Symmetry: C2
Subunit: 245 residues, 2 copies
């Protein structure tokens, strides 16, 4: 690979508990160029995304969330098996919140907001007999959302909070690299992960397949499930395509 | 008078400054019974009211406010010329606020609230040559509004504040008691007043006429204008009728 275009979709249902359930869906599109740094292989490039979060509070109601974002990233891939990516995302959001107060009271909201998310991720691939691999991975993630706050004089006050959150993520995948008649590479794996959040914890189990289908094509699909403290993700799908061009 | 039914309407435009203009309109209805306490004349009774406040913020929008209230009151009237009334009002309100954030953001609100207002008022009538009178008056007023506050998790916060406010009021009226052929009493006066508010200042000028029209009827009408710090009341009308039954 000397770089290429790529597209990735995704969709994850969160059941976050006391309590709201949201469905987060997205689409990224992107391009990088690659080069030979001796000992490794370097990748730099950028991306464009949509993102849609659809939420629900119990009796009440909840928000919808739409957003464009752009981003830039570098990736290294070592001969020895080390990888790391860092990625910077800048986003603008549009939320239409819609609540109820069980007393009968109905508050409506509608506003734009700004986000950034920076993440850094690395890990190593240890090959094992019969083309099975082992792959520990670490991902720290930082992001900020912007605030807003106004006020109808002699009465009402509305504040949107600028929350700002760190993530750590630990995980391991086991798979087999398996070569089909022709040139194809189907490469299944199953994945175990832990992740937590300080925002100014949970375990995840999933499985995927990444195929290299001869003539520059690449397909990835994975499923993920997570249970945790606040958190509960009955399903989380990612599908991705890349052209080695 | 041994008591009777009464109705009073009113409407006052406030231009309160940095900035919102509101029009406050109302209707009270009420009844009291009267008796002879030697040296004076005592009045006790109750009332029912509607009240409508229609507000406006600059570019933005603003609220509407509807409310039922009930109340109870006593009044004393001395032979010597001293009067005092105390009145307790209990109310429930319905506000539909509607704002804009000049950034494009639109927040909507809709809720019920509770109020009470207790006031105590007194003063003396000094008669002067040719049936002109002088009448200093003092009015302290206490009232509380109730609060409300909810919150869309991991985002938005809405607070309505329970404000709670004292008023002092100083004023003087000069008029002439004037007796028409038959039995009628037209009694004009002009009125100067000061009032301020600690809420956890301004001067007022107006004029009225109170008629006793033979056979138990009573009519009052007044106009009032006020200018002050925060405050500016280009107009404030009160009309009232009472049947001496």
């Amino acid at each position: 690979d000397a770089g290429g275009p790529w597209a990735r979709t995704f969709s994850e249902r969160q059941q976050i508990s006391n309590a709201y359930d949201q469905t987060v869906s997205g689409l990224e599109i992107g391009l990088d160029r690659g080069w030979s740094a001796s000992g490794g292989r370097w990748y730099a490039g950028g991306l464009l995304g949509y993102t849609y979060a659809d939420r629900t509070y119990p009796g009440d109601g909840g928000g919808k969330v739409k957003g464009l974002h752009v981003g830039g990233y570098a990736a290294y891939v070592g001969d020895g098996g080390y990888y790391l990516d860092t990625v910077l995302r800048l986003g603008r959001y549009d939320q239409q919140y819609n609540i109820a107060g069980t007393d009968g009271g109905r508050v409506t909201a509608d506003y734009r907001t700004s986000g950034a998310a920076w993440s850094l991720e690395g890990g190593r691939r240890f090959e094992l007999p019969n083309d099975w691999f082992a792959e520990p991975q670490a991902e720290v993630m930082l992001w900020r959302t912007s605030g807003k706050r106004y006020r109808a004089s002699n009465g009402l006050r509305v504040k949107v909070d600028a929350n700002t959150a760190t993530l750590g993520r630990l995980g391991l995948r086991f798979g087999r690299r398996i070569a089909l008649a022709g040139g194809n590479i189907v490469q299944p794996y199953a994945r175990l992960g832990w992740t937590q959040e300080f925002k100014s914890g949970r375990v995840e189990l999933g499985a995927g397949v990444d195929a290299a289908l001869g003539k520059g094509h690449n397909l990835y699909a994975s499923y993920e499930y997570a249970a945790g403290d606040r958190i509960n993700i009955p399903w989380s799908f990612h599908a991705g395509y890349r052209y080695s061009f």
